[PDB]
Amino acid sequence: IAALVVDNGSGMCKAGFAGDDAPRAVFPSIVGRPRHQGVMVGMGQKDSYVGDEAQSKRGILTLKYPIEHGIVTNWDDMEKIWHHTFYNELRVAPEEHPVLLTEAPLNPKANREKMTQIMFETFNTPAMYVAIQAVLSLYASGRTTGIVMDSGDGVTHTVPIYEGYALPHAILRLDLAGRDLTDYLMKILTERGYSFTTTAEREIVRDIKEKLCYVALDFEQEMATAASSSSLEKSYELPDGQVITIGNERFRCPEALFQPSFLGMESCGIHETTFNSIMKCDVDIRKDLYANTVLSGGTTMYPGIADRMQKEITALAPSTMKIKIIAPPERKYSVWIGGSILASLSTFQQMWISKQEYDESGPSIVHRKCF
Amino acid sequence: IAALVVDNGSGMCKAGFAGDDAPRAVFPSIVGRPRHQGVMVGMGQKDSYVGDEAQSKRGILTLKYPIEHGIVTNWDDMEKIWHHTFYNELRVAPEEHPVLLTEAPLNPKANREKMTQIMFETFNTPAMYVAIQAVLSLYASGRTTGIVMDSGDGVTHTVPIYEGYALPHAILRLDLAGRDLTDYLMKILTERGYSFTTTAEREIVRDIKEKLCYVALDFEQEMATAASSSSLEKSYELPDGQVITIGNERFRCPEALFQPSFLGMESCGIHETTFNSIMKCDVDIRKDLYANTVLSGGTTMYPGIADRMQKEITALAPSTMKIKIIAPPERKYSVWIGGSILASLSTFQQMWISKQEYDESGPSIVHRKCF
Amino acid sequence: IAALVVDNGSGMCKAGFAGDDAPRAVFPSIVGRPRHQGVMVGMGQKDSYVGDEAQSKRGILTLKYPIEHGIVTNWDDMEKIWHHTFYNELRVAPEEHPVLLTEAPLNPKANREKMTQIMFETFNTPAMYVAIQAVLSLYASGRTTGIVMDSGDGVTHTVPIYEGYALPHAILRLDLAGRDLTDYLMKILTERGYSFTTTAEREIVRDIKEKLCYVALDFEQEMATAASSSSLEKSYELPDGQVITIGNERFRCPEALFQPSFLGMESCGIHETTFNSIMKCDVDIRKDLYANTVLSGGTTMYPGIADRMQKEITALAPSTMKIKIIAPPERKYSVWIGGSILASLSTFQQMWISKQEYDESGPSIVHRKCF
Amino acid sequence: IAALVVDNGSGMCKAGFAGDDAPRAVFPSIVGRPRHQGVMVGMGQKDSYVGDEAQSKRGILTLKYPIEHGIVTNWDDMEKIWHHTFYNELRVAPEEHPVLLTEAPLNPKANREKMTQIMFETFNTPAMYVAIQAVLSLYASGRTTGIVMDSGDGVTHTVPIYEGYALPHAILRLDLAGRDLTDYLMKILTERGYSFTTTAEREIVRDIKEKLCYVALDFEQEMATAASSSSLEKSYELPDGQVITIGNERFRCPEALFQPSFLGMESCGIHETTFNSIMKCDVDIRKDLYANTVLSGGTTMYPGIADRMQKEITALAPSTMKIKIIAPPERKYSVWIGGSILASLSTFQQMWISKQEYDESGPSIVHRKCF
Amino acid sequence: LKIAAFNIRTFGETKMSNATLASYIVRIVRRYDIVLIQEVRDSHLVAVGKLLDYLNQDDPNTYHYVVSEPLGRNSYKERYLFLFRPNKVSVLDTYQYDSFSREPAVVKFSSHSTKVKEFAIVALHSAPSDAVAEINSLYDVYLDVQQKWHLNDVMLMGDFNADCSYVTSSQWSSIRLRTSSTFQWLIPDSADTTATSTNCAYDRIVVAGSLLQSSVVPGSAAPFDFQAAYGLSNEMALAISDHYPVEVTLT
Amino acid sequence: LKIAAFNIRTFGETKMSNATLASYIVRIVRRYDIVLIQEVRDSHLVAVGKLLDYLNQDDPNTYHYVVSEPLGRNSYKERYLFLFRPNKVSVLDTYQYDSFSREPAVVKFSSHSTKVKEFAIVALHSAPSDAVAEINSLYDVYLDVQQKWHLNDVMLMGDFNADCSYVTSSQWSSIRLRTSSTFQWLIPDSADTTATSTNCAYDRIVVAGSLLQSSVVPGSAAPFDFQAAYGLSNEMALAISDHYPVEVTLT
Amino acid sequence: WXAXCPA
Amino acid sequence: WXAXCPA
Amino acid sequence: WXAXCPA
Amino acid sequence: WXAXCPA
Ligand SMILES: Nc1ncnc2c1ncn2[C@@H]1O[C@H](COP(=O)(O)OP(=O)(O)O)[C@@H](O)[C@H]1O
Ligand SMILES: [Mg+2]
Ligand SMILES: [Mg+2]
Ligand SMILES: [Mg+2]
Ligand SMILES: [Mg+2]
Ligand SMILES: [Mg+2]
Ligand SMILES: [Mg+2]
Ligand SMILES: [Mg+2]
Hints:
The complex is a heterodecamer, with 4 copies of chain A (371 residues), 2 copies of chain E (251 residues) and 4 copies of chain G (7 residues). Chain E is of the alpha+beta class.
C-alpha cells in the first residue's frame, strides 16, 4: 500500500514510508574497510561497515563515500547501502512495496540506467519512479511557483518553477556544496595551528562546521571586528579531550559559498547563481519568481543565511521588488517530505514504471515515461 | 584436544593444559651446569639441573638464565628446559597434541625460525601456533578494547588493541624490566654495607625485592620521612642468620620503572612509554584506550603501582578524562590464563600451523601465518 | 590609397588591407585577466592578454568577450582589442590611412555613436565608415541581387537586396547563433558524462563544434541510426590526453538552428526565418530572390547545411520554384572579402565621412550621411 | 650591502651569501645541553653546542631537533642555532645586510609571526623576507612552469606553478619524509637482530640510510630476488667497531615513500600525491605540468628514484603523454641555490620588508606584504 | 688409606662468617682422605659450596663431594655430606636404607692401595633421646647390605651418642652391637670423643668382615685432640665443634 | 687526596659492553679523587658518557670530566680524560701542548687541603719507540710551565714505556729529569706496573718543585694490585687492563 | 565524472 | 542590450 | 603541531 | 641481540 521513498545521495541517506512526517532511517552513507590485519580470534566483526557502524569506529576504517557530486562513482559499495537500508535498518522487505528514488538534475544518463537495473534485478521492486530533488521541494512547502536552491552535500542546483512546467533551459548546476566546503575548513584550520589530514578526522571537522560556523551580514566589516576582539572566539572539545579555539575563521568558511574565488572555483557565487537563473526566463514571470524563493538542503542551515541572501539579491535585483526568502524550519528534510506527499497522491499512481514496462523496452524506458 | 599452552618467558615459565584456570607447572627457567663434579645418591642430572632442583641447590650449581630480554641465547640450554617441562613436570608426551607458544613483540625473526624448527624436529609436535604475549592478556580480562602493558621479567612493552585490530605502528618495546631492577637493588645494597656478588646472592635479593619493596605515591615526600623516621625501615632475615635493615631502599628500587635515569637508561619511563603508544594512535580511538589500560606482568604486583600510574597519567593526559587502571586479581598469570581461553576456542582451530604445512614451505611459514 | 578593413564580429576578429583577398590579422577577440597572484618574480608578466596570448594561456586567465550578440558591452576591453590589432598584429599606425568597420543590422543607436567617437579621439584616424555585414557579402559573391543569410557567432540576420535599394521593412534578426550553439552543446555533453562548466574549457567545446558535428538531412531517422549503431560514434582527444566519444550528440547540436524550441526560444527556425523574409517581399521579386541565396558566416561550415537548407525551403515554397543555394568555399571570410573589394573601389571614396564633418555636426551625423 | 640567504629547515641549515653557487656553512640542525658538568681542554664551560660540535661529542649531550615537520617547537634554542650561524660560521655580523629565510607551505601563521619578531629584535636585521621552499626550488632550474617536489627531512609538499602563477588551492602537504624513514628503519632492523634506541645511536641509522638504501623498480619481484640471493647484501662498519649485514631491508625503508601504509599513515603515496595535485589544476595546463616535474630535497637522492616515479605516474596518467622527470645533479642544495638567484635579482629589491614597515603596524606584515 | 669421622657442631653458613674457624676446618679436612660431616644445618647446599671451594681452589679434583637430601623427620634436617679424594678412592654406587629421625646412607668405595677391594661406610647421627633403639635396627641393616650388595665388610660408624648415661650396662647388653663379635668397637669407652672435659665415646667405630680387621692398623683408631694438636684454647676448640674427631687408618 | 694514572687498555664500547668489567672499573675510579684515563679509543665520547653516569647517578656534581680532543699526530688519535671531584680540587686553566705521537695536556688543580695550593698536571702516553725521543723533550715542557704559568709545583705522569728493553743504561743518562735533582722519579724500577706477571715499571711518577717534594706522602707511590685485592683471576685482571694503576697521595 | 571533475 | 537579453 | 600531529 | 644491547 504505502510506497517507500528514499532521497539517497551524498552525506546522510534518509528513508521512510509514504505519509510519514519525518524520515525514520537517517544515517551517513559511508562504506569503509579495515586497514589492519585482524588479531583477535572470536572478534567476529565483518570486513564491511555501513552507516552508524562505520561512524562509531571511524578511527580504524577508511571511509569512502560511494556518491560524489551527485554521480555514483562505485557501484560495489553503493549496493551495500541500499541493501543495509531495507534489511538491517528498516527491517521491511522491498519486494512488496513501490520504491521512489531521487536524484539531482543534469546528471549523466549512465547514472540513471544503472540505478534502474539494480532496482529491478537485485531487489525486484514492483514499480519505480525517479524524481528530481529540486521539484520535490515545492510539495514540501505546498506551493506551485518559486525557485528552489537545493544545497546538497555533493552538488547544489537551482530549478525555476512557475505553476508547473519546469524550465529545462534555466537549470544551473554548481559543483560547490557542503562536501567541498569541508575540505576548505581543513586548509583554513592549518593556518591557526590544527592539522586534520586523514579522512578519519574528516568527520570531526564536519561536526565543528555544523555547531560553530555562521554567516555574517557583511564579511568585510566582520573581518575588522574579529581581528581586534576575542568575542567571536568560541571553544570546542575534541573527541580525545583537547580544546581547540576558533577565531575569525568561524565565518570565513561559510563565506566561500558567496565568493568561490576563495576556493579557486571560477563559477559565480551562490546568490549570483540564483539571480542568473531568473534572468534566463521571460520578464512576464520574473515578478512572481522574485517573491517565491524556497531554500533546501543541509548547507543552508547556517544562521543568518536568510538575511544574506535577501541582501545580495536586493542589490542585483531592481529596487522596489518584493524579495521573500522562504526558509521554513526543519528544511533539512524538505526533499524527503515532498517525496512522501507525492507518493500518497492518487494521480501519481499512473506515473509509476512497472517491471513489465522495463522488461519490454529495456532500462532505457526511464528516459521516456519519467522526467 | 587438550593442547598444551606454555609461556616459556624470562624468569619463571608456566605450563599447563587447555581449559584449566591456573597453570600446573610453575618453576624458574634456570638451567645450570655443576661447578663441581660431585655426585649425589642415585642422581642422573650430572649434565645440568633444570627447574626447582637448581634453585634448591644454588650453592653448588652455576645458575644461568637462557632467556635474556625475551631473546633465546643458548639453544642447547633451551632444549633442557623444554624436555623437563613436558616429561618431568607435565607428565605428558608432547607428540600427542599440539602446543601454543608466546613471544614478545618486536623480536628478531631468527628467534621464531629456530624455535619452530626445534619442536617440529626434536618433539615432532603435530601443530603449533605462536601468539604475542601482550595480545593474550586481553583474553584473561575478556575484553576487546584497551592497551596492554606486559611488564614482564625481561621486557616491558605496550600493545594497543582496538576492536580486535592491533596497530603494528604503535607497539613500543622497553628493555628495562624486573630482572634489571634486581641488579639496581644490589648496587644500592653494596653501598649500604651488605655485598652481593655471587649468583646465589642474586636470588636472595630477588626474594627481598618480591617481599618488601613497594611503589611510593610521591617519591620526593618519602625522602623527608625516611631521613627522619625508622618506621619505613623493615628488617628481613638473611639465610645465613644475619638480619639486615632496609631503609629508603624499600621504595627506591621500584622507582627505577618511572625514572630510568637511575641505571643510565636514556629511554622514557613506564608512565611515559604508555603515553607515547597512545599518542601514536588515531584521534577517534584515543577515547577508548584511555578508559581501558590492562596491567599485567609480575613486576606489577608492587603495592600501589596502579595508584601511582593513575596519578602520573592523569596529570599528563588532558583533564576531564576517565582513566581506569584495570588491575585484575592474580595478574601474574594473566598471559597463561588468556592462552587457555584461546586454546579452547573453536574459531582458533583454523589458524594452526600443521606439520604438513611446515614441510611444503619450510620453516618460513611462521612469518606468513603467525602475526 | 591603402585602406584598412576590420571585421568587428564577436569572437573572431579579422583585419587587413584594401584590395587583398585574405586577411592577415586573424585572432580571437577575447580579453583575459589573471585571477591569481604572481609568486614568481622572474618577469613582470602582464595583467591583460588579448588574442593569441590569451588563447594559449587560457587555463589561468578569465576569458571575457567584449562583444555579446554583436553588441558592445565593455568598452574598456574593446579598446584593448583595437589597440593590440593595430600595432602588435598588423604593425600599422591607424592615423596614416583610413579604416573601415563592419557591424550587424538592428544594432543599438548608442553602439554606433560610441564606436565612431573612439575612432576620432582615441586613434584619430582620418576617416572611417560602418557598413552592414550582410551587404558586404553580396560584393564578395560578385552578384548585386539576392538574399543574404549571415549566421555568425553572436547574431544571425537576413537582408533582402534586389539590384540595390535593400528593403528595410523585410529584415529579420535572430539571436540564436554560434555562441548559443556552443552553450547548448555544453549542456548536451553533460548527459554523456563530461563536464565543461568553467569558461577556460568553453573553448575546447567550440573546437569540438568545428571538427566533429555535422548536419543530417533527416533529424528523426538519424535517431534510430545513432541509438542502434556505433558508426556515428567518433573519438576526440582533449589537451590533457583523455579520450572522449561523441555519439548521437554529434548531429543533435547543429540541428538546433532549425528547431529553436530546444533552447526554449520562441523564435522559429532559420529556414522559416529565411522563408518569412522572402514572403514579406512582393511577388515580382520573390521568384528572383529564390534563385540567388547566399550563406555567410562561421556557422555555415557544417557539412550538408546547403542541402539541408534548400530542402526546408523547397517544402515551404510552392511547387515549380527554383530553390538554389550558393555556398562557395572561403565563405567564412565572405564579409571581409567584400569589404576589401568595396574599399578598393574608387567609387566608394566619395561617401566616406571626414573628420571635419564630425567636428561640425557631432557624432550624430553617422545616422545621416552613413546608413 | 649583500644579501644573506638561510635555508632554516629541519636536519640541515645551509647558509651563505647571495651570488654564490654553493652554501658556505652546512651543518646538522642539532642543539644539545650537557648533562654532566665538565670542561674540555682550553674551553670555558660552554653552555650549549650547535651543529658539528653536537655530532662530534654525541655521547655527552642531549640532542634535540628544534624543527619538527617544518614547525618550530622551541624558540630559546632557535635563537641559539641562528646565533651560531651568523657569528661562528659565517663570521659576519647580521646587522650589516638583510637576510632571507625559507619555510614550508601551509605552516601555522604563528610560526611566521615569531620568525619576523626574532629577526627584528635579537639581530636588528635591516630587512627580511620569507619565501615558500617550493617556489625557490624552481628558480634553480630556471624554468617557469612545472610542479615542485620538495621532500625534505620532515615535510613533503608539491606546489604546481604555471607561468609564474602559483595555484594555492592545489598545494598538497604530506608529513611523510626522511625523518619518519629514520624511525621506521629501526623497527625493520630490529627484525634482523639489531637494536637502536638512543638519540646518540640514532645517527648510526641515518648513515645506513644515506649510503645503502635504494629504491627498486618492482617491489614484489625484487623481494623474491633479495630473499633467495646474497648479492643484495652489503656489509657496513659501525663507529663502535662491529660489522652488520643489510639484506632485504635495504630497499623496504625507501619503499615507504610510495606505500605509506607501512607507517600507518592513511595518506597516499608520494607518486599518488603528485597525481592528485595535478588533477586539481585546470585541464589546459595539465599537459605542461606533466612534461616538467622537478624533484628536490634530500630524500630524492636515492638511486633509481627518478625511474621509479616515472613508472608510477605513467600507469596513472593517460597514455600518449610525455612524462619527463627532471632530477638534475646537485639537488640536495637546490632550494638554497634558488635563494641566491632571487636575492641577487634587481626585481626583488622592491619587496624587502624594512623595519619601517614592521614598526608602524607590528609583525602582521608577513601575511600581506610577504607571500 | 686414612678415614676420619668429624662431627662439627651445627655446620652452617653462620659459622663461615668467622674466618679463623673456616681456616682450621680446612686444615682438619685436608688431613684425611675421606671424612664425614654431621649436623649439616645447610638447607640450600651453600655451606658445602664454600667449603669445597677452599678444598679445590688450586687443583679442581683435590676433593670430591657426595651429599644427601635433607632426611630429618623433625623440624631440623641434616645431610650426610661425604668428602673424598678421587685419586685415593673411587665411589662405585650409593644407597639409602629404608625407625630413625635421620635414616642412614650406604655408599660404595673401591680401594686399590689397601688389601680390601671394596668397602661401604654407613654414617648415622642417632638421636640422644633414643640412642638405644636406633643401633639395634642397624643389625638388620648389616644383614640387608651383606647379600643385596655383596660386601664382605660392613663399616658402620658415626655419632651414636654412647656412654655418659645415654647407654648403661643393662642396656649395653640390650644393644646388638655388643652381642655379635663380627662387628667390634675400636674407640675405648674410657677415651673421650668430646671437645669438652667430659669423657664420652659418642663416636663409635666398629669393624665388620675379617679382611678389613687385618687391614685395620692396630692402635690407629683414636680421637684427634685438635685442641692440643693445634695449640688452641678450649673456647677456640669449642667454637670449631663441641666434639672430638675420631679416625682409623687402613693398610 | 689520592692521585693516580689509569692505563685502561682499548677503552670504549667494546670494554663497556661487558657489565661486570664496567663494575670493577667503577669501583677502581671511586678510590682516587683525581684519576688519569689514557688511550681512550672512543671518537664520539660515547664511552666517557657511559663511564660517567655510573659515577654521577647519585649526585650530579660527584665527578667532573676534562676530556682532550682528538690529538694524535699519528694515524690514530686517542684522548686524555681527567675525572676529579669538585669539592677536592677545582680546574682553573687547561691548554694543549704549546715530536709526539700524542701531545701532552696540561691542567690546573686548586688543591686547598694539601700544602701545595697550586700545582699542574701533565699527562703523556709515549709510543713504545718514541720514548727515548720524548723524554728529553719533556724537560723543555717544564721550563715552559715555569714562566708561562709561574707555577712552582709541576707533576708529570703517564705511560712513559720505560724499562723492559725499551730504555737501556746507554740512554738512561739521556733523560734530563734523571740527571736533575728537581725531577725525582718516584716509582722504583723493581716494582711492576703491569697486570702481566712479568715485571715492567712502564709508568713513571715524576715530581718537580721544592714545595711539592715534601707534599708527597713517603712511600705512598706504589702500584695498586687490584687483582689480589679484589680476588680476581689472571684473566679478569687482563680483561680489565694490561697495566697496573699507579697512585700517589698528596698531603 | 568521466573528464572534467574527479568523479 | 538593456531589457530582454543579457546584453 | 597543536592537535593532529605530535608537534 | 647482535649489536646494540648485550643480548
Ligand atoms: N569550420 C567550422 N565549423 C563549424 N563552426 C565554425 C567553423 N569555423 C567557425 N565556426 C563557428 O562560427 C562562429 C562564427 O565564426 P566567424 O564568422 O569567424 O565569427 P563572426 O561570426 O564574428 O564573423 C564561431 O563562433 C565559430 O565557433
Ligand atoms: Mg541531497
Ligand atoms: Mg613476559
Ligand atoms: Mg560574423
Ligand atoms: Mg626542506
Ligand atoms: Mg654440637
Ligand atoms: Mg666412656
Ligand atoms: Mg694496551
